[PDB]
Symmetry: C3
Subunit: 164 residues, 3 copies
């Protein structure tokens, strides 16, 4: 009953990531599923090698959730008479890459300190906001540690975007 359904849209879901070697200050981009299950891309919105390609200039709502999981470090142990230690952390950043502009722009960042006292831990980081994007722009999701990303379920780790 409408014609605004021709707007670029995409919902991508996590897939097994390929273990890569990187420096602490490096944030690997995630690989996504774009056609199977709940994943999809329509109306010219295309997915290609970690990037979501913007086909039309306009304001887009961009979102992503990344569930992290891992064994509890020793952040919580037996310190001194009141001298704890720095906590670990996890981070998700949604980045925008423009061909005319080399240096990527960080649009969203979700960062959390981690220092649990249990056997193991897990938690999601959700991010969502509206940005003005240009045709040709490319979006990618970077995380602090690929090995901590839960890639098991399409409903726990995803990334999507739509033209408003």
């Amino acid at each position: 009953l409408r014609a605004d359904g021709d707007k670029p849209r995409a919902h991508l879901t996590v897939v097994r990531q390929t273990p890569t070697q990187h420096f602490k200050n490096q944030f690997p981009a995630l690989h996504w599923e774009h056609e199977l299950g709940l994943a999809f891309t329509k109306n010219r919105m295309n997915y290609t090698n970690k990037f979501l390609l913007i086909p039309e200039s306009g304001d887009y709502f961009i979102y992503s959730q990344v569930t992290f999981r891992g064994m509890t470090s020793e952040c919580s142990e037996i310190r001194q008479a009141g001298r704890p230690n720095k906590p670990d952390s996890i981070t998700v950043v949604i980045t925008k890459v423009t061909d005319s502009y080399p240096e990527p722009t960080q649009l969203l960042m979700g960062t959390k300190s981690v220092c649990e006292v249990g056997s193991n831990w897990f938690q999601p980081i959700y991010l969502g906001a509206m940005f003005s994007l240009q045709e040709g722009d490319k979006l990618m999701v970077n995380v602090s540690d690929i090995s901590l990303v839960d890639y098991t379920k399409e409903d726990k780790t995803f990334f999507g975007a739509f033209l408003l």
Copy 2:
């Protein structure tokens, strides 16, 4: 003041939960307020039997936040033996029922490990994403533990959806 405004929309808010009988091993569904305070259903969106009934096929953005609260368990107090205990957890899942399976499809899931050290705790889990739905499809929010859900305020626990 817009032509494209007759779109199905709804924002549901939490209420004290009426106990429902425990029949099977599954996440119990939350039931909501849909017409009082900040809650509403309009343009054919139908809130029925704990489900948000989709009146028109298309792409919808659905979202929910559930705030959990409780007394701290004994997870923190690990048996003196250099061995931490398995952490507790809280989960929120948004499910789709299409009657075309009719096995429910989990659209979004937010799950966090919980091993607090204070006397008590509380935290929210927020989820939101876009999905292609058909008329007749049904959406519900399920949780890991009804007794841990904060039902005190309409602004702390809610669920909503709108046609893009």
Copy 3:
């Protein structure tokens, strides 16, 4: 290219907060960046006096993320009586002020208990939902403690809204 690109929209980003003498019986409102970097206001959306002024009645999706951070307190140090301490907490509330009703209406609230063991901690609280708003209504983001708000990056703390 479109026809609905004339809808009120805005994405606000954090800035160093100016010390204020707020009333102890209320959460201080944050002030934002509205035109530099990733921030913007358009199609009549008006950011004035810490408020996002609604220029057109309709249904709006509003969101915000506030990243909090601080040096851990004594909560982690359970009482010498083998009893846990009441936790500290961080809260974000998105409030609506109307010309009609005298008191403000809380639309969204994200509240989290804080009782870390590490030396320091940091975490984001993200909120997003849809509300029916009338021209003239004003939206603001209030927080429990301004000194715990990370004002460092435009991608960590933000606030936005767009007409549906």
